[PDB]
Amino acid sequence: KDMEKGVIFSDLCNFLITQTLQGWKVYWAGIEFDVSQKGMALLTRLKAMTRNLFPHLFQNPNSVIQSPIWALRVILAAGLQDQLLDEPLTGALGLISDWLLTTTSTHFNLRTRSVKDQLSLRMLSLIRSNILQFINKLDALHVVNYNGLLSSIEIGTSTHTIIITRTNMGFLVEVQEPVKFSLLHESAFKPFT
Amino acid sequence: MVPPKKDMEKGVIFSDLCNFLITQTLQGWKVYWAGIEFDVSQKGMALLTRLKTAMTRNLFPHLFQNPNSVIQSPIWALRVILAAGLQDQLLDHSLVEPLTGALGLISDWLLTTTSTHFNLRTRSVKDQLSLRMLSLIRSNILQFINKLDALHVVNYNGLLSSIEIGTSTHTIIITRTNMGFLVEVQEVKFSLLHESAFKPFT
Incomplete structure (x- = not known):
């Protein structure tokens, strides 16, 4: 029982990042994502008429470009929030979503035991299938x-x-109530479609 | 003050590769290993146990006409298939890689024991578990499952x-076979893995 919980915790509460020749490989919830490094260049450059479509991003001194990793984290957080629309586990999903969204730590800490007691393979399987669904919704x-x-x-x-x-540049991702935004190339999700 | 990024990574990779997590479902088992899920049917043992006492019986006399063959569970079959995929991988590399030692030990564990946790106490090998290595392992296991599927x-x-x-x-x-994959190990043990376990990876 300790075993299962620890295995699940290792996968759900760590967001691994490794640098590759193409960018980064990220590993979370037992799913791999390859994140291309091309990005900040184009966005910061145009800070291609997409610009006019997003003046609040490209023509706003109070907008902040984030890394593509940030974009992936935000997307995963969003997928979680999307499953959240559906009770004691609800708070666990909430905490993990919050951790992905609002922090840059690669390891989820607070509140370890509370969340951990709720972790199971069944729950992780639900999370994974829901994430793949959300990704296919994005692809749709x-x-x-x-x-x-x-x-x-x-x-x-x-x-x-x-x-x-x-967009033509891939998935533009933004977080608001100031604004933070980034871009995730479509390649990141190619394996799931 | 707290384990560096590389140490958390190594721990996670260790947990994925050295735990073979098995759970009961209404359909059989769900297994989780290397960050991969497998749904394994619990069915099919009756067929085997009957045959062991057609074209199948004579096709596999060492299994079916052999009082010393032993029928294993489908979980065992899956473990053996994963062990085999790892051996297949390690034969394509050279001993000069940490990945070789790891593939070998993990494969021996899956193949020869029933334990669900692998107590890996060779600091040497643990210290070289990485996300790159796990990625290569996952890639090759899916490639091997596709070879089986074809x-x-x-x-x-x-x-x-x-x-x-x-x-x-x-x-x-x-x-x-018509019933999925018949898996055998000799130095005889055998079982059957229903093909649905691999359907998601096609």
Whole structure:
């Protein structure tokens, strides 16, 4: 029983990052993601008419470009928030989501035992299948000339709003109530589609 | 003050590779190893136990007409298949890699014991477990499962229907049948893994 809990905790409460020749490989919840390093370049450069579509990002002194890793973390947090829309485990999902969203630590700490007692393979399996579903929901999106309703997903915590938008440059990701944003290349999700 | 990033990573990789986590479900078992989930059916043992006392009985007399063969669980079959995939991997590399020692030890553990935790106390090998290594392992296991999936069911004109992996110490044979994969180990033990376990990876 200690065994299962520890195995699950190792996978769910650590967000591993390793540098590769292409960018980074990330490992979380037993899923690998390859994150390309191309990104900050284009975004910071245009700070390609996508610019005009997002003036609040590219023409705003109070916007902050984040790394592609940040973009992935935000997306995973969003997937979790998306499962959250569905009770004692609800708080665990909440805490892990919060940790992914708002911190940059690679290891989830507080509150160790509380959350840990709820961890199981069944729960991790649900988390993984829901994450893959959310990814395919992102993949379902259409790149569209204008803003449009059909090219983005929005999830809204009590303390944050996450917008993920599919563009010609890949997945533009933004977090608001100031604004933080980044870009995740579509390649990161290619293995799951 | 707190374990460096590399030490947390090594711990996580150790936990994924050295725990074979087995849980009961309504359909059989769900196994978790190397960050990979497998749904294993508990069924099929009756068939085997009957045959052991057709074309199948004579096709595998060492299993079915041998009072000294021993039927194992499907979990054992999966363990043997994973062990075999690791041997397959380690044969493509050279001893000069930490990955070789690890693949070997993990494979021996999965293949020859039933324990669900592998007490790896060679600091040497543990200190070289990495996300790169685990990634290579996962890649190769899925590649191996795809080689198994592309086997034809044993047939009249000898279309490739099995894979054999030989160690200094064991011989592992995995054969495609109408009932899924018949797995055997000789130095005889055998079982059957229903093919649904591999369906998600096709």
